[PDB]
Write a protein that binds this ligand. Sequence first.
Ligand SMILES: *[C@@H]1O[C@@H](C)[C@@H](O)[C@@H](O[C@@H]2O[C@H](CO)[C@@H](O)[C@H](O)[C@H]2O)[C@@H]1O
Ligand code: MAN
Ligand code: MAN
Ligand code: MAN
Ligand code: MAN
Ligand code: MAN
Ligand code: MAN
Ligand code: MAN
Ligand code: MAN
Ligand code: MAN
Lengths: 106, 156, 191
Amino acid sequence: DPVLCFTQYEESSGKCKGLLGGGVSVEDCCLNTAFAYQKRSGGLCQPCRSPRWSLWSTWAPCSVTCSEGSQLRYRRCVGWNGQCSGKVAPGTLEWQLQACEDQQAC
Amino acid sequence: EVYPIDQFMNNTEIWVFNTTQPDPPNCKKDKSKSMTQTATSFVRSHVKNGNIIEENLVGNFTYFNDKEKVYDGIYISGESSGVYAEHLYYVSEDKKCGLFQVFAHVNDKTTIWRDVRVSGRPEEGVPLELNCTKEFDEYVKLVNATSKSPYTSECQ
Amino acid sequence: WGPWGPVSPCPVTCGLGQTMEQRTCNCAGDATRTHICNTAVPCPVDGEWDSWGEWSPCIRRNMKSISCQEIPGQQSRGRTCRGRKFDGHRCAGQQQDIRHCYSIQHCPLKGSWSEWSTWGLCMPPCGPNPTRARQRLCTPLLPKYPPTVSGEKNVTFWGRPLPRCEELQGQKLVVEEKRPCLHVPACKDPE
Ligand SMILES: *[C@@H]1O[C@@H](C)[C@@H](O)[C@@H](O[C@@H]2O[C@H](CO)[C@@H](O)[C@H](O)[C@H]2O)[C@@H]1O
Ligand SMILES: *[C@H]1O[C@H](CO)[C@@H](O)[C@H](O)[C@@H]1O
Ligand SMILES: *[C@H]1O[C@H](CO)[C@@H](O)[C@H](O)[C@@H]1O
Ligand SMILES: *[C@H]1O[C@H](CO)[C@@H](O)[C@H](O)[C@@H]1O
Ligand SMILES: *[C@H]1O[C@H](CO)[C@@H](O)[C@H](O)[C@@H]1O
Ligand SMILES: *[C@H]1O[C@H](CO)[C@@H](O)[C@H](O)[C@@H]1O
Ligand SMILES: *[C@H]1O[C@H](CO)[C@@H](O)[C@H](O)[C@@H]1O
Ligand SMILES: *[C@H]1O[C@H](CO)[C@@H](O)[C@H](O)[C@@H]1O
Ligand SMILES: *[C@H]1O[C@H](CO)[C@@H](O)[C@H](O)[C@@H]1O
Ligand SMILES: *[C@H]1O[C@H](CO)[C@@H](O)[C@H](O)[C@@H]1O
């Protein structure tokens, strides 16, 4: 199945940049480890470098009116031809849930 | 490596030949009476003002090593000098010399010392294996400890 | 439109590149048409450091045992250059990490109860009824050893002692409190 091959991956908010085109296999795209690929025209961009966890996102806001609430954060296994820490497959997310208080918790 | 304390202590008499214990009593020795699979029951003896004092103790075998396959230490409850733990860290090739880490706690002071112990009556003109005594001498030099021999030939 | 000219030589020496052909009006539409070219040659892949991993045991050359004593030993840990391939660069930097240590490995010590830790994370995240935990721990009374120099060099405490404290609420090592995390948002995947 042909993928979309890009010349650059953006380490921040992982996105493909510098489109080459769309009729290539992953193997040929990723012959260059600086490259990145996309499954089909607008989905998840995976870089061709070896898999490694991405940086945690910033904390999403926490669901409160005035009280104590909670908030989420995530990171993703991103890359190709391998596995991240803990025998995990590319694309798999890891989540962290933190308690939160915006105000004095009235 | 880890030498078995259950093998070293399955002998009739173990004498303390040298120690950094502050002001130790004379003729400190252990006499095995009956060892179990997880603990050894033994008699700890020493001399105080010419009087022989005997404590009937139980040392529960445990592991201080990482592999946790060979017993190398004992916990002791109610030892009169406050010794709560002993760790065998060296045994000589002839198996007559052994080096011990002794942990004691008596009235809000926990302290440590080391012993050279002999699995039998020490001899007069036969010194222990040079590696056994040399490691202890190096410890004494590196810690600025004062060493004393509780043993004499007059010990019963 | 004239005829398509030849495709230019692929401008890369490994992996994929973009080659174009041109035309001349001899005209609406494209004068140029680009293609992906495959070299079929893999590019070099630079190696990348693994993580250090665990410290080796604290030992002194020609001293069998240091534990529970104010006697510096030293320790090392290693990491491997992984993934270097098709003539990529070797890793830069030190392969081995070394430091001076004090061994308190398996030393039974008198303990006192620590103050409460801060609340941990909500576990399991996104799971059903996620709850977080905090603990009070039996901390051994740490020795006041000097961080002087065996050359001036640092000496770090290492090893897991076996701290002895009076029992607190039926536990000898760890007292744990749980608490639900409340008003848990749902883990909407962003794709
Ligand atoms: C031509 O020969 C190849 C074997 C490579 O050594 C090429 O260098 C590579 O050029 C690409 C840029 O497209 C980089 O991604 C690689 O890092 C670089 O090694 C050389 O130009
Ligand atoms: C997430 O956790 C910390 C920051 O909170 C960092 O080690 C890194 O950003 C990681 O991805
Ligand atoms: C989330 O937690 C705090 C924000 O309060 C920061 O350390 C950072 O924004 C992190 O992503
Ligand atoms: C380009 O496309 C084809 C050749 O591949 C022909 O129809 C013609 O040469 C055109 O200019
Ligand atoms: C050039 O492209 C094609 C010829 O192949 C036509 O659409 C038209 O002739 C244009 O000039
Ligand atoms: C090794 O050194 C420290 C770990 O102690 C970190 O910066 C990182 O894990 C590195 O691989
Ligand atoms: C060894 O030193 C300490 C543990 O005492 C940690 O920073 C880490 O485990 C390292 O590998
Ligand atoms: C446990 O720790 C110390 C005693 O070891 C005291 O602060 C208190 O008894 C606590 O429960
Ligand atoms: C933890 O709980 C409260 C404060 O959070 C206090 O009783 C004390 O600090 C304890 O360690
Ligand atoms: C647990 O609860 C509050 C709110 O999250 C924290 O600020 C604090 O760390 C406490 O241990």
